[PDB]
Every structure is written in structure tokens, then in C-alpha cells.
């Protein structure tokens, strides 16, 4: 399944992941795609902080949905 | 001769637009509605203007009617309000590249991670950290006229512009009560600048209130803030003259 | 302006369909952004008097809500001593640009008919209404008469 | 001279203006660099509203000064 991750500057990185993939896996893919370390990534969907233990189906992230990416220290 | 329900003008079908409930509006009214939502005081969700319609304008009609800049800024503001709903008002943008980032609000070392920027700043005075070592924001501002004039101007601005604890937008009151409802959905007080929880924050004893120490609802803090701004200006001029070696106003006229 | 077109249309619709409890509407065609009128309630404790009100529309109408101010004094939990009303349908957070003045007036009349003491501008009158409406109503009748 | 503008979202854009340039020109440059219609731009400098009738020199706006765009919210 194809999802979009928009960064703060507006860069929209497209990801191919399964609905049963954990947010930790999504952040690891973001790392190996762009280089952002997962311990610094924060994913947000509908204003809820996505936990590294939940999955795309837990937040019901559907096809071609947008996830907002913010950075920590 | 189809009549728009918003502006009441008559147009043909080609110059119209609809929502999911097939309400008919003119394209210019939808444009001004999105403008009031994005670059003005309005809700984020471009809902159908009619109250009977819980639905909204579909994204296809938006992408067909709204210009490119309005739609881009709409998406940007949606991201802004989602960040506000997520990590509240802890996102700080770099003074050199506006690159947003999150910090715990306990450390002032904002090193812009953007490789095209990577500038170490201080989130309190927007000053460079390599110069800011061993010195406070006051001292680093006093070390230069370019720093001090701008710092005084920013103090005079903050003395009036009231920031929202959610989207961080600056607000002023045109008229009315001291309860401010931001366009992101957060309520605040125009006297104490605190995120209120409703109308149980103000005083409702109209009979000088000596039964509750709560903020008034109709008091205009215009004169107080103006006097504070004028005092900031005067004291800044005095400081400049006192530490100016025989040298030669910071801010607009005070009327 | 959109405000001018919309308010001339709404006025042309009111002048044909007069409102039952809102009468004597006065608007200068040279300044459509201020309306004056008389609220004429149907039910006790307010049905022995009438109340002058003013509606002020922003220049950005209908994309921002109007404000209503009572000029006549009224005894009501949701209207303060300066005549300001916090009519929810025209709050900034609820406002829909499709809302027309006839609906705003209907909402105001419904509030006048049935106070909402849970969210009051005058907590004293809200307490009196919620605890003993008969007493509230007598006080309001006397205030309307006076 | 180089001045800055704070948008409603909070971003800082950089403008290159002259002291004799008017508030109309400033708002036009803001619209060119961000898309904000000048009719919906409310400008504040050091806690003072920038009226279009005057000019930057009438507000003592110098180099590296930051103007702010704020919301003209009503009261309720
Ligand atoms: Zn229209
Ligand atoms: Zn609809
Ligand atoms: Zn930076
Ligand atoms: Zn500092
Ligand atoms: Zn806000
Ligand atoms: Zn307060
Ligand atoms: Zn009190």
C-alpha cells in the first residue's frame, strides 16, 4: 500500500508499506530512505502522536493517506 | 439563471460549484470562503457553507476552483493545525530558514538540522549561540545597536500581539469581549493571555469587582498596553543615550 | 461588495416576508452594515414590552458573523447590562457564511423564549431562573414594565 | 534595506524595501512572496497598526526590523 509522508518543509516522500506495519517499521523505512534517525522522527496522523508499538491499521491509516513528520533534538 | 445561496448573485452552471449535498454556490464565493479560512479568521475544514449540510466541499471541487496558492496555503495551514493538535505549541522555526523542529522547551540550543542551514541560535532572542555564550539575551542585545533596536521593537510588539497556545498565531481584538476564539479552535483571555476553559474564567458580578479576582470580560487593555509600549520605548532611548559615547528613537510614533 | 449584494438581497427577502417577532426594521441603503429593529416577544415574561436592538455586520460579511446589541434594557440570564448577547449561532467558532439574518433572529427569539442558564452572562439571573422560574418571571415582568 | 515579515502561520520571510516605500507596496511584496491578499493582511510594528495611508518612514521601520501579520479577531 502506498502512503505519503509530508515533512515540515513540504517534502512528500512516498512509502510502500502494509496496513499491518508498525510505526517503528515506518520510521525505519523513513530512515533508510532519507536518513532521518528514528529516535528523532515524530509521525502524526489526524493530530495523534503515532506510537512506535501501534500499527497502520490501529490508526486506520487508509490508502494514500498523509502523515505529518516532525523532528526532535 | 441559477442563484448562488451565499452571495445571492445569478450565474450559469459552468460558473458554479457544489458540495457532497449538491448545494450550489458561485466559484467566487467559494474562493472568498477559502480565503477567509486560510488567510483570515475561519475554520480549517472547508465545510459546506449551509448549516443543514454536515458534508463539505469535495477535494475535487477545491482543486478545480481554488487557485494554486490558496490550495497550497490551505494544505500548509492544515499541517500547522495538525502539529498544534499533536505537540501543542512547542514547535519552533529557525530564524534563518524557518525550518520547524521540536524541543522540550528546556534547552535553548536550536541547531537547525537542515544541511542548507545548520545555524545554532537561541530560541529566546533569536541570537547566535557562539556569541551568546557567557552572556544573557539582554547583554547580547546591548552589545550592538542592530540587536538592541530590534529587541526593543520585538518587546513593543509582544506587548500587544497575543499569541495562541495552540497554532502560535498572533491575535488582536478589534472590538467586543475579552474572550478570544482562535481560528484553530483554542480559547484564550485578552487580559491574562492564558488559555481559558470557557466563560467560567471571567467575572459575572455587575452590582470594581470585590467578590472574585477573575479577569473582566469587557475591560479594554488598550491603554495599559499602549502605556507599557511607550515606557519600553522611553527606557530604551534612555539606555541608548546612557551607554552611547556622545552618539545620537526605537519604534513608531506614540501619538 | 459581497456584503452589499448579500445584504440587499436579504433585505429584499425580508421586506417581502416580514418577520413575525422582528418589526420596524430600519436600514440606511447608504450603510447596509447597520440594521435597527424592534424585537416583539410572544410569551411571558417579556410579551408586555418590546426591545430595540441593533445588528452590526462586518465588512467581510457573510464570511464573518454579525454582532447583535440590545439598546433596551432586558432582564435575561444571557444578556448583560450593556445589551450584549452571546448568541451561539453567530459565534466566531460556529459561524457558517450561509446563515441568514432571519435564522439569526429566530435563534435570538428562541433564546429569549427559553434562557440557557447553564452558560450565562449574568450568573445571578441564571441561578434565579434555574431555582425558581416563577420568581424569575415575576422579576422579569416587572423589569419589562419598568 | 532588508526587513522581515512574520506570517500568520509563524514563518519568517525576507523582504527588500525602501524607507519611502508605502504600506501598499509592502503588502504587495508580501502577497508576491506568500500569496496573502493585501485586504486580509493586518500588519503590526512594535505594537502599532500599519495603515496604508502612511509609509514605512512614518513608523520608523529600519533595517532588519520584523513586521508581524496578526488576526483582527472580534470579541465574544
Ligand atoms: Zn456566491
Ligand atoms: Zn451542502
Ligand atoms: Zn535554520
Ligand atoms: Zn538568548
Ligand atoms: Zn490558535
Ligand atoms: Zn483572564
Ligand atoms: Zn466577581
Numbering used by the authors:
A (entry chain D): 1 to 73
B (entry chain A): 512 to 718, 723 to 763, 766 to 772
C (entry chain B): 1 to 146
D (entry chain C): 1 to 76
What does the paper say about this structure?
However, RBRs do not induce the essential closed E2-Ub conformation, but instead stabilise an open E2-Ub conjugate conformation and align the active site cysteine in their RING2 domain with the E2-Ub thioester for Ub transfer from the E2 to the RBR E3 in a transthiolation reaction. We focus on the first catalytic step, i.e., Ub transfer from the E2 to the E3 (transthiolation), and present crystal structures of both RBRs captured in E2-Ub conjugate loaded transthiolation complexes with an additional allosteric Ub.
Similarly, the K63-linkage-specific RBR RNF216 is allosterically activated by K63 di-Ub, but not other di-Ub linkages. We were unable to crystallise the RNF216(C688A, pSer719)/UbcH7(C86K)-Ub complex with K63 di-Ub and instead directly mixed RNF216 RBR-helix (C688A, pSer719) with a 1.5-fold molar excess of both UbcH7(C86K)-Ub and mono-Ub for crystallisation without further purification. While the active site details are clearly resolved for the HOIL-1 complex (inset), weak density for the RNF216 complex means the isopeptide linkage between UbcH7 and Ub is not resolved.
